[PDB]
Amino acid sequence: KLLLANWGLPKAVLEKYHSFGVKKMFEWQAECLLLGQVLEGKNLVYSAPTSAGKTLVAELLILKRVLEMRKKALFILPFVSVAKEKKYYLQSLFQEVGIKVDGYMGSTSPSRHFSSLDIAVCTIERANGLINRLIEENKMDLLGMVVVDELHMLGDSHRGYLLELLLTKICYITRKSNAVQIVGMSATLPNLELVASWLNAELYHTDFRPVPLLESVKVGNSIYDSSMKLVREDHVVSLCYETICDNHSVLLFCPSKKWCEKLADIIAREFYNLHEQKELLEVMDQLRRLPSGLDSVLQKTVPWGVAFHHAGLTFEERDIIEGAFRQGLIRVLAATSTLSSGVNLPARRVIIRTPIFGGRPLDILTYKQMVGRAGRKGVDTVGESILICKNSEKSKGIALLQGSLKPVRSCLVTGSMIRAILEIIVGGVASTSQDMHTYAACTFLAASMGAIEACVMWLLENEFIQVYHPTHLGSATLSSSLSPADTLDIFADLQRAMKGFVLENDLHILYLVTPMFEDWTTIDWYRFFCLWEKLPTSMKRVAELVGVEEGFLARCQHRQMAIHKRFFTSLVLLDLISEVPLREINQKYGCNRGQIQSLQQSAAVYAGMITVFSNRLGWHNMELLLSQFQKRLTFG
Amino acid sequence: KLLLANWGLPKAVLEKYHSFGVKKMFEWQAECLLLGQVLEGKNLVYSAPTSAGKTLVAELLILKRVLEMRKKALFILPFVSVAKEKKYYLQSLFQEVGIKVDGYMGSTSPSRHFSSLDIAVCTIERANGLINRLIEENKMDLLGMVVVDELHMLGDSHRGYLLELLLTKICYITRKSNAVQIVGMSATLPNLELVASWLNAELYHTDFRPVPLLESVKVGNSIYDSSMKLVREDHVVSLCYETICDNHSVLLFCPSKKWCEKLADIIAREFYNLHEQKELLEVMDQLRRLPSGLDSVLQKTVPWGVAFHHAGLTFEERDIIEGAFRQGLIRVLAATSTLSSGVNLPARRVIIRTPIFGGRPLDILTYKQMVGRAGRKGVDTVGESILICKNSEKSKGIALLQGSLKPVRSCLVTGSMIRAILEIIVGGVASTSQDMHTYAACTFLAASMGAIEACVMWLLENEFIQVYHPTHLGSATLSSSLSPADTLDIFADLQRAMKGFVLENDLHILYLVTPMFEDWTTIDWYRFFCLWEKLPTSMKRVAELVGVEEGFLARCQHRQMAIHKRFFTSLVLLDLISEVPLREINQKYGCNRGQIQSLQQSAAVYAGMITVFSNRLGWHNMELLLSQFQKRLTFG
DNA sequence: TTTTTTT
DNA sequence: TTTTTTT
Known part of the structure; x- marks a missing residue:
């Protein structure tokens, strides 16, 4: 049974x-x-x-x-x-x-x-x-x-x-x-x-958890349960102290990375002044052995006190910190939203700390994701969740303690619907408008109970279809697997390139490869001008041929903003392909060390998408220039 | 023995x-x-x-x-x-x-x-x-x-x-x-x-010919031998008449192609009015079967009278005329300098016609080459050479009848010497200047008895060498197998191209491929302006990006002349690659029909030389654009 | 503070 | 009026 x-x-x-x-x-x-x-x-x-x-x-x-x-x-x-x-x-x-x-x-x-x-x-x-x-x-x-x-x-x-x-x-x-x-x-x-x-x-x-979860809110010097019941000045050091005594794990969450690493050593300072080892030295050797080997304030408290973990570290260094948690050694740490949805690291008690995260109330799904980390597969007995909050934000803690998820919406003119119909008309399935109305009658928006007719109006003013039959541009969008909103940007990039491509250096091929922004890093003004007004004569000419001009930078349209915001991302990859050591590039550009290694993965993907965009459209010369370089950008 | x-x-x-x-x-x-x-x-x-x-x-x-x-x-x-x-x-x-x-x-x-x-x-x-x-x-x-x-x-x-x-x-x-x-x-x-x-x-x-050669000069109504001896109003028709009666061959040479074809039918008109066949109809069918099949005044007198042969015809049509001469059928023809050095077609009597050829006296080597055509391998008995000339040019005939070849020169600053030393210094054989003097002491100019020291001066002002060791440009010239005089032109063509190459059409790649001029055809002014000022907007922009400008064409430096004389040759190949029938291209451009088919052979050779010029120098991007097209130009 | 496409 | 190179 x-x-x-x-x-x-x-x-x-x-x-x-x-x-x-x-x-x-x-x-x-x-x-x-x-x-x-x-x-x-x-x-x-x-x-x-x-x-x-x-x-x-x-x-x-x-x-x-x-x-x-x-x-x-x-x-x-x-x-x-x-x-x-x-x-x-x-x-x-x-x-x-x-x-x-x-x-x-x-x-x-x-x-x-x-x-x-x-x-x-x-x-x-x-x-x-x-x-x-x-x-x-x-x-x-x-x-x-x-x-x-x-x-x-x-x-x-x-x-x-x-x-x-x-x-x-x-x-x-x-x-x-x-x-x-x-x-x-x-x-x-x-x-x-x-x-x-x-x-x-x-x-x-169903609703039944393997390990009963004691969810409480701490104010002052008392503990109140979910249903306003008492069971037993932040005193997190005291709270952490009572947990390691029973040889188990602890974990606290912080709203920022600077707060995350500062609080992992502020507690460590308060631990050393008051005062397993077999693998405690293996990790220490790993820290200095690293190709980068920065060995920041993390190195001080890896074996002794409390360290920190987030997404601002190398994929290997950040992952290794999680490796020690699986075996032993370090017990206390701060993580921010990195362990909320990144990976699953169980702990005995979880201190959500501030009820407000990122200047806004913590989401019900995020709070439930955060709290649900506590509890092993029968190793422990009870899981706990502490929310430290005083005076203000009292209603925020209780309301978030007793809450439920909102119903499912449908998010459906809307760009989520333009792509909805452009993958069947192009596919040859839905051709006649009378038959096209059958398709929208079985969507999930129907069960959640016009603008459907205006959907093809945008596909006629902007060339995407031409009974309806697919075209060259409409077919090209689907093969590359990118939304129709983005095609109108990438298409304009390639049309301008054919009138005077620069073949000596590699800055012109780089510009048509870098992903747009994806909000990878805040752009630091007053640093680009120092960086830009020192480039060689061969590189400045490429910038003026793609849209970048000294008329917007530091002197203050989406099309004009998209061609200038793409230049900064292109210059970072210029020093990656020239084998410049990572130590200087993360300081000259002023970009975080944990974001530079995230651009390399997102740049090799975008390089291989633009060659396909020209294949399904037909452009023999532009394929060779883009395809012969997509491998070089992957290296370095 | x-x-x-x-x-x-x-x-x-x-x-x-x-x-x-x-x-x-x-x-x-x-x-x-x-x-x-x-x-x-x-x-x-x-x-x-x-x-x-x-x-x-x-x-x-x-x-x-x-x-x-x-x-x-x-x-x-x-x-x-x-x-x-x-x-x-x-x-x-x-x-x-x-x-x-x-x-x-x-x-x-x-x-x-x-x-x-x-x-x-x-x-x-x-x-x-x-x-x-x-x-x-x-x-x-x-x-x-x-x-x-x-x-x-x-x-x-x-x-x-x-x-x-x-x-x-x-x-x-x-x-x-x-x-x-x-x-x-x-x-x-x-x-x-x-x-x-x-x-x-x-x-x-040695000096002994298998067939004795009766060389004579005809004036008026008499024949005078070489040593001023009489042996027997042009009367070429009469001279041709007495030759075909003994079932053998005749041949006359003319100073121009228009004169060649006109005189092959002027005599034919004088032959029909006075008035083998198994293969006489096979050639006639071949004439209409041809891919071009113009069937000009040649078709009228192929089976009946006198036809013409020169280099202004297709390689197949021109060759076929020589094919009939090997078997039978046609006997009389005019050739100009085509059969002087092209191929060997024996005939009984050869009428050099005018003593002056091309406005200048016929060369001693050319006259001996022309005259030596007469005589088979024992089939005939005596060869004859008739020089028809009256009144003026009397001394020209006798002096050319009794003459000898000039002694061998050495043709050696001279461009034939710059290349002479640039293929050993680059080759690593001759390095030291003292040793370099040994090389010039064994050349043929030594036996025919300074400027040798100034030879390397031109190789220093113009970057070709750098004890002396080869460089990148010096090595690149020898691999492509072209003279150092031409490199300074091709090098400047490729340097300008890297700043704004046009990738949409194929006119920009064509310009860097066409051979310079080789004096292929006289350029017809007042026709380019009609042809140029009708090109699409995509083609006019390429011309302005390579040197061509509306400041020299029809408005009247070697560098400025070399970039404009190359444009006309590039436009002819534009209609070859677009599969335009040959009937219209030879009339719109006004170029001879026998020269259009000579450019296609000389264009595939030059296309494959410029890719090597960049390989031995190092240019990865420009190789792909040039190499991916060199096959397309060969077709069509 | 935190992610994801193509040969 | 008439020729010739490179992978």
Whole structure:
């Protein structure tokens, strides 16, 4: 009954599960799987607890459809790191079974043909591109499952409306032509049934945590529980002191990185003045061995006191700090929102510290994500969450203590709808306007109960379509997998380039490669003028040929702002390709050390997208210049 | 004794010779081969008759050295067509023997590795490039023979000073370090011994023609022989009439192409009004079948009367006219200087017509080349040469009848000497100035008895060298195989291009490809303005970016003249790559139909030379643009 | 304070 | 009126 080995599943999967330490499943898994015709092609939406095997139901369901129907099954995750972890887990499981597992996260290409894969794991954007390419190829017949994780982001996010568009597209094409199951999961929402009806699915929600969570708010010198009950000047040092005495973990969250690192050593100073080691020296040697080896105030308190962790560090140095937390050594740390959604680091007591984060009240989802970190897999007994706040912000703490998530919206003229219709008209599926009205009648906005007719008006004033048939520019946007809003910027960049390209240096090819801004770093004025008015004569001429001019910099339109904000990002990569050591570039430019290494990953991706933008349009000369350099930018 | 089969030679060679119709050798071959130590490494210079097996001695000698020493043997010819004919002959002979025969003529590449060849046949320029590349590689040890044909061009030509430079270079490098024989031949010169001494060679000259040549000058109504003797109003029709009656061939030469074709039908009109056939209709069908098929006044008199032949016709149509002369059909024709040095077409009587050719007296070499066409291999009995001239130009006929060739010059600051020293200093052979004086002491100018010191002065003011060591520009000139005078023009073309290359159309890549002018065709003014001031907006902008400007065209420096004279040649190829039919392009541009098809061959060669000019200098971006198009220009 | 596309 | 280079 309440044990997975009793159920029918391949033996190797349960050997792999029990080898890790997995045990008998809880009741919510049985309730999810025994809802009725869920095991069949009827879809399913469930809300199992996040910290108690939420993905087990979907993982068990994904085998049945790809073994019986044997068509395909996607898998969608929001972030690259969790995508990689799930990719490795699904590898060790399914490849042992024999079901091929493919990854699309980050810059990692599949390196294999699509038509011989089953459980391709993507990160929304890759899945959307794959679906669009399949539709533009007339190969949707091979699709059996679309497993969607974290369904609650479809309404308020910059990457969930893609999930909405994908789901309505596949549902429309399948019904107009359930052989395809759209099983998914969310955390907890009031209007979960309305989502299930639009997916033609059942529904069941549960609420039970493996470790009871003692949630409290501390004011002055007392502890008050959630329901205004007393159970037992910040005194965080005292609070931290009572926790390490029972050889367990502690964790506190801070609203800023400067506050994060300062408070990890302010407490350390108050710890040394009052006053395991086998691996305590291995990490110290690792600190000096590093290629950068800055060895800042972190080095002082790695073995002795309290260190800090955030995203302003190197992917290796930042990750290593999390490595010690898994074994022992350091116990106390500050993290900011880095561990809120980055990775999962359990701790005994979590001090959310200030109720207000970033000048605004902490979000209900963010607070629940922060608090849910506490609790191991039975190692500890109770999890705690302390919110230190005095006098003011009293109502903020209690209201955030007793709150619920808002219902799901639809985020739907709107740019999330312009792309919605431009991937079926171009795909050849929806051609006639009368038939086009059928497609919008089955979208999720229909179940949540015009502007649809005006959608093609914007696609006529701006050349995207021409019964309706695809064009060269309309087809080019979908192949590159970028929104139609961005095409109007990249298109104008390449048209101006063909009239007098500069071939001697590499600054002109760099400008057409760097991603726009992505809000990577605040731009420091009065430093560009010092940096710009020293460039060689060969580099200043390229800047005047792309839009940059001494008429806006330090002298104070989106098009004029987009061609000047792209120059600063291009100059940073100029010293990366010339093998200048990282020590000086992060100081001359005045950019943070944790952001420079994040531009290199985002620059190799954008380089390989513009060559495709010209292939599907047709430009033989511009391909050679862009394609012969995209490899050089990756190095250095 | 006087028969080649008696001598020691491979049997298959003599089977191949006698199958064609070759017979016992004459006395001059025996005298050449039995001069003493000529058969050894001692060099040889001989002057056997041109129409009586001149090349037989060299062909027989080339086998012994490549079979005994087995190092290499070059072969140098002045023209592409004779090079191809000799390539096929040497193929059928040596490949039957087993000695590999390689060709370098025209655009035909060897398509095989150099290090596995013996008798590579070149056309001066290819041989010079091969020698320079071997020297810049330290591989001169593998060289056993350099057979040079038509040694009399080393003094007065645009392509013989290359032979002089090659010979002095190889002699200097061999003696300073005869293992290499430099056996060659010339027609007849007074100072032949002085040439033999500088080559360290014997000498023997002969004068005996297989067919006695009755050379006469006709004035009025009488015939006078060479030595003012009478033997027997132009009356060329009468002269032609008495020749076809004995079923043999006739031929007359004209000073112009318009005169050539007019006089071939003026006589035809005077022939029809007074008034074999199996193949007479095959050629007529070929005339209309042609891809062009203009079928001008040539078509009227191909089967009936007299046609014309020159270089203003297609390589196939012009060649076919010569094909009929080999079998039968047409007998009378006019040729201009086309058959003087192009190909060998024997005829019974040759009418040189006007003593003055091209507004100047006919050259002694040209007149001897023209007259020597008469006479078959024993088919006829006597050859004749008629010079029709009245009143004026009387002294011109007799003086040209009794004349001899001028002695060999040395053509050596002089641009033939700047390149002479720039291929050893760059090659690393001659480094020290004291040693550099040794090289110039063994050149042919030494035997014909300062400015040598000033030679390196021009190589310092203009960057070509930097003890002396090669540089990037100096090395780049030799790899491309073009004279240092031309580099200073091509170099300035590419430097300006890197500042604002235009990538949309193909006019900018065309300009850097077209050969400079080579005096291909007279430029017709007042037609360019009509043609230029109608181009699209995308093409006019390219012209202003390369040097062309509306400040010199039709409004009236070598650099300013070289950038404007190259534009007309570039526009002709613009309609070749757009698949415009040849019918209209030869009329809109006003260029001759026989010159348009000569630009296509000379444009594919220059396209592949500029990519190498940037390789040996180092320019990654400009290579891709030039190399990706050089194939497109070849087509169409 | 914190992420994500293409061959 | 008539020719010739490089991968």
